[PDB]
Amino acid sequence: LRNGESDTKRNTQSQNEMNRTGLTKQYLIDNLQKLYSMRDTIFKTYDKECFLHIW
């Protein structure tokens, strides 16, 4: 006559960490055309509201 017993306890603790970084650079020719008046329109509002418009 043979009797057996058996126990077991497991305990697993895990940790993850994932860091992602991306930089998608897109070259459109349209964005180059819109560059033109970007700086100039700064001094079109200066001209209209601070300086004399008659010769």
Next chain:
Amino acid sequence: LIIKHQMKLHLNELVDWAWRNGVTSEKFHSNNGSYVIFDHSAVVETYIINKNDLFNVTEEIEITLDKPIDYFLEKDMYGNYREHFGIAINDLLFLNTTVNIWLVNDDNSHILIYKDGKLIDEYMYHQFEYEANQNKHIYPNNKASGTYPHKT
């Protein structure tokens, strides 16, 4: 939860403790009347200090969830026992499962600090500190290790 802890330290241990827990200026007397003077956190003047001279120093150990604990024992709700060194109680990944946490005192004596989800108050901690190692017999040993240094 701040606990006073009075101890007797040799010269090396006293110097180490003083430099870790910054002391701007203070004189420490010893068992045998020798003294060491710290000035501007630098040792300046020491009397005739023999080996085995004991200096009395009291340090405050504070037990809080947020600050690290040097050595503690944790019991999960499932029945697992684990030991953690030098991490805060909150630093456990799953504090939810933890049921009891006992501080360890280098004498293999456990003192309950965390039960039922909350810290143990100061007075129950004092009770458990008395209670943990009642029948602790320390070896009795006495050597003078000194004699009146001067010629008299």
